Design an enzyme around this catalytic site. Structure first.
Site, PDB file in Angstrom:
ATOM      1  N   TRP A 151      25.012  -7.565 -21.685  1.00 41.47           N
ATOM      2  CA  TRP A 151      24.325  -6.345 -21.427  1.00 41.47           C
ATOM      3  C   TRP A 151      24.841  -5.772 -20.111  1.00 41.47           C
ATOM      4  O   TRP A 151      25.464  -6.496 -19.304  1.00 41.47           O
ATOM      5  CB  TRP A 151      22.776  -6.519 -21.476  1.00 41.47           C
ATOM      6  CG  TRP A 151      22.163  -7.450 -20.481  1.00 41.47           C
ATOM      7  CD1 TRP A 151      21.685  -7.100 -19.278  1.00 41.47           C
ATOM      8  CD2 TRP A 151      21.900  -8.898 -20.600  1.00 41.47           C
ATOM      9  NE1 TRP A 151      21.179  -8.185 -18.626  1.00 41.47           N
ATOM     10  CE2 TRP A 151      21.302  -9.298 -19.405  1.00 41.47           C
ATOM     11  CE3 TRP A 151      22.134  -9.875 -21.586  1.00 41.47           C
ATOM     12  CZ2 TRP A 151      20.917 -10.617 -19.146  1.00 41.47           C
ATOM     13  CZ3 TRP A 151      21.752 -11.208 -21.316  1.00 41.47           C
ATOM     14  CH2 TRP A 151      21.146 -11.553 -20.107  1.00 41.47           C
ATOM     15  N   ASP A 166      26.320 -14.106 -19.665  1.00 43.73           N
ATOM     16  CA  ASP A 166      25.693 -15.389 -19.579  1.00 43.73           C
ATOM     17  C   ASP A 166      26.765 -16.467 -19.495  1.00 43.73           C
ATOM     18  O   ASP A 166      27.925 -16.267 -19.904  1.00 43.73           O
ATOM     19  CB  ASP A 166      24.799 -15.648 -20.778  1.00 43.73           C
ATOM     20  CG  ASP A 166      23.570 -14.795 -20.782  1.00 43.73           C
ATOM     21  OD1 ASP A 166      23.117 -14.340 -19.685  1.00 43.73           O
ATOM     22  OD2 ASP A 166      22.952 -14.549 -21.826  1.00 43.73           O
TER      23      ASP A 166
HETATM   24  N1  LIG Z   1      18.396 -12.665 -21.350  1.00 47.02           N
HETATM   25  C1  LIG Z   1      17.112 -13.385 -21.488  1.00 47.02           C
HETATM   26  C2  LIG Z   1      16.551 -13.139 -22.871  1.00 47.02           C
HETATM   27  C3  LIG Z   1      15.244 -13.875 -23.093  1.00 47.02           C
HETATM   28  C4  LIG Z   1      14.047 -13.722 -22.400  1.00 47.02           C
HETATM   29  N2  LIG Z   1      13.126 -14.579 -22.920  1.00 47.02           N
HETATM   30  C5  LIG Z   1      13.694 -15.246 -23.937  1.00 47.02           C
HETATM   31  C6  LIG Z   1      13.220 -16.219 -24.795  1.00 47.02           C
HETATM   32  C7  LIG Z   1      14.064 -16.737 -25.754  1.00 47.02           C
HETATM   33  C8  LIG Z   1      15.386 -16.306 -25.873  1.00 47.02           C
HETATM   34  C9  LIG Z   1      15.887 -15.333 -25.007  1.00 47.02           C
HETATM   35  C10 LIG Z   1      15.018 -14.825 -24.045  1.00 47.02           C
END
Ligand SMILES: NCCc1c[nH]c2ccccc12
Ligand SMILES: NCCc1c[nH]c2ccccc12
Lengths: 360, 109, 361, 119
Positions: free
Chosen positions: D49, D68
């Protein structure tokens, strides 16, 4: 002489049960669903969901569906994306359904993992990162359709007035409607006119869903509606959640699963906070506002208890709210919600709670 | 009282109390399987003043319950007295060895 | 402009590194090793170890060995117990070595996962729940065979004065010595006389390990010795850690990896707490006591910081202690230890910390 | 201000550091990496992103790519959830509530980097 046994069913009736989807973000490979009794806060059981599980209960109340990702050695080896079917009363695994290795990995918005009104198909969001909607035939235990027409769209909003129809929000600011045939393949589709400006007034994806229409709130506190009483969806809006006093203090919506609708009254519930500006759209609620969607005016406002997500039970006139760790239970049989209790430590990192369905 | 670590029957529990996890003192929560094997504690009954053998069977095949964690060590001994030892997973021989919670099963005097 | 890259090595040199084995008991399927710099408390990296990982560093300093359990679908499906070989500097996976599905699942005592002095074999505890010792041939990447002679025994104490020999503590209160051949099979064995009474004076399994002997402390604060300078192990004890004042306030040992030996000085380090009684053998340290093993007298006592486990570095004269979450670094070049720093939040649930090896030939 | 390797460590490790304005995750600089390098044994995501962040030191706006680092379990350190100019999944590459490791050989995400693309 006492004897330890297994094979037991959940100790409280289905109508008492709620499902708190714990992402366990700090240890996201051990996500799980926690099952609670909302009447007394008792922990009833759980379902393990590996890496970033998603969950829903079958419309008939008999099964729990999860969606998750495995690898042969967790952090290495071959990927397997699946839907699992679990017995709702025994909380046991029954069936795995293979998915293509592109199911959405992300936080638990309701619209990422849904089902048709008739319960015969599971409808889930993919991202590879190109987006499509996947269709699972529950009876066959098979992934049967990949709706590439939904490229550039996001999330699934089932139409409660049709057996196998749903909508998705697209990058053009409109909605795409998909009507599935009885084989789970696309039978027809349609696109609405633009509902909202993507650049100027982006909506939250969470619907306030009625039997034949859905309402959406925007980053700036406006409301859009999609009427699907007909085969073609008719779109309208905006009207503002805000009066002049509200605007002076910069009130705007914020949260994740942040809205809900009480269908008998038309009341819509929304998490709001003051001092809104760019970047505050996921802030915890300072208040819950109760909006009359017919008159398009607020009727009540109550403290938000830092909640981020909610869900509504129509038949018992209840609203749950969730701040990440704790679940609040509200009676919404009258316009002002009444707090009945709080379930502390229901999760470490949950942004989604759901009732067991009782409608059948 | 049975959900407290200080309940007399829990005197050699190292784990989560199943009674806090949707089960009871002597039954596994739904969808978790009892271990056939166990460590044993000798616990003092505060009512009749007698000592009782308690068998601590784990409930297996689900991830950690996380509630009512206890670590009590009355008459617990190291792994060279293996069935008195509670620093190991008594689910070790189950079809799935993942540990969910621990039961406290009264055997007798 | 900027470009994200991987493939990097650990930023601090090996001699700065320590390994905190985090069980993550609340989510035990996502256990891991946290790598820290003990000189400044910096987090350096980590190695994922699935369900209840165990860890050691190769004696030559080049590799990290983990031991763990997988199942095909975590909570269901076929089980795979393994040793993994990881590169120490890149913190990357290199090789999986298959084990029989009975490696010990339990908290991280050093003795459950060890290696021979010459580095050629990994030596690990099995429990099915019948106990045996597993031997892994590091060069071959193979499991050799069970040491079934060790039935009814527990834990592995390597003999630092021999290339491929180790001992284990048995239910009869004595020690079994195993001598491996070049292929990792048992070449010979021997059993000591009774060292301690299992009923009346049970010992903690954690050795205070010298080059040619090992000391053990008991639930009631006695010390026992095993001398393996000769082919037959000679056992002795008890002598008491305690003076009259100590006894009066019921001081006893408590913890997990709760002792250590500084080999050059013969000083033994032990976690101790007052008001001992049945059930307190895993209590956190109220104090650390420092004993002269030659004179059999205490030479120092300092606050324990609620520590449960420790490890000693002979090459830099250091002791680490660990309270479950935080690591304390001590200088032990003199009889009284000196606290250098604390690393806060090194783990959520760790009972084992280890240095990266320096020297040690 | 444009070179975090020259800056104060505690400054770049803060959720408030200007280029972290759309980070939802653990900062890799707290996880044995740096702002622009994955910690040892974790693999950059080829997709990300993107955020637009204001640099208060020089008064200009920069595009930041949030990749990431993948293939290791959660770092657990320096969790941030900042949302400047972040949008929902119908604007997918502006959206940070998904796993940008989703297309990697292993999708387990470890931490997030904040890579300066340009003005
Ligand atoms: N880039 C983080 C995305 C995210 C936030 N909470 C989550 C829970 C599960 C998977 C991804 C996320
Ligand atoms: N019965 C609890 C044994 C135990 C304590 N810590 C552990 C870590 C991993 C496995 C078992 C344990």
């Amino acid at each position: 002489r006492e004897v330890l046994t297994g094979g037991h069913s959940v100790s409280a009736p289905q109508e008492n049960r709620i499902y708190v989807m714990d992402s366990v973000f700090m240890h996201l490979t051990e996500s799980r669903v926690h099952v609670y009794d909302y009447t007394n806060g008792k922990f009833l059981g759980m379902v393990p969901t590996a890496f970033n599980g998603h969950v829903q209960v079958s419309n008939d109340g008999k099964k729990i569906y999860t969606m998750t990702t495995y690898h042969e050695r967790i952090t290495r080896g071959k990927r397997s994306d699946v839907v699992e079917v679990w017995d709702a009363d025994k909380l046991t695994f029954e069936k795995e359904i293979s998915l293509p290795p592109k199911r959405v990995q992300g936080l638990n918005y309701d619209g990422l993992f849904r089902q048709t009104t008739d319960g015969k198909f599971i409808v889930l969001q993919n991202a590879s990162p190109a987006t499509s909607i996947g269709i699972v035939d529950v009876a066959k235990g098979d992934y049967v359709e990949d709706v590439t027409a939904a490229a550039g769209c996001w999330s699934v909003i089932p139409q409660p007035n049709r057996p196998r129809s749903f909508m998705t929000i697209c990058g053009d600011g409109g909605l795409l409607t998909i009507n599935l045939g009885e084989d789970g393949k696309v039978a027809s589709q349609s696109r609405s006119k633009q509902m909202f400006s993507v650049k100027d007034d982006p909506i939250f994806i969470a619907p306030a869903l009625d039997k034949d229409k859905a309402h959406f709130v925007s980053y700036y506190g406006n409301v859009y509606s999609a009427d699907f009483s007909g085969d073609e969806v008719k779109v309208d809006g905006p009207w503002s959640l805000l009066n002049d006093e509200d605007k002076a203090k910069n009130w705007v919506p914020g949260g994740y699963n942040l809205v809900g609708l009480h269908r008998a009254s038309g009341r819509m519930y929304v998490f709001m906070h003051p001092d809104g500006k760019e970047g505050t759209h996921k802030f915890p609620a300072a208040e819950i506002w109760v909006m009359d969607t017919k008159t398009k005016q607020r009727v009540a406002r109550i403290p938000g208890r830092d909640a981020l997500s909610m869900t509504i039970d129509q038949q018992r006139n209840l609203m749950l709210t969730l701040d990440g760790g704790n679940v609040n239970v509200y009676d919404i049989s009258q316009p002002e919600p009444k707090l009945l209790r709080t379930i502390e430590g229901a999760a470490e990192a949950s942004l989604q709670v759901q009732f067991h369905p009782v409608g059948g | 009282e049975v959900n407290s670590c200080d309940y007399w029957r829990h005197c050699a529990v190292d784990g989560f109390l199943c009674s806090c996890c949707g089960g009871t003192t002597t039954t596994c929560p739904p969808g978790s399987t009892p271990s056939p094997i166990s460590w044993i504690g000798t616990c003092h009954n505060p009512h009749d003043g007698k000592d009782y053998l308690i068998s601590y069977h784990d409930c297996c095949g689900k991830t950690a319950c996380g509630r009512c964690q206890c670590n009590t060590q009355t008459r617990e001994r190291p792994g060279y007295e293996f069935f008195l030892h509670n620093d190991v997973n008594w689910c070790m021989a189950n079809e799935n060895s993942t540990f969910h919670c621990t039961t406290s099963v009264l055997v007798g005097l």
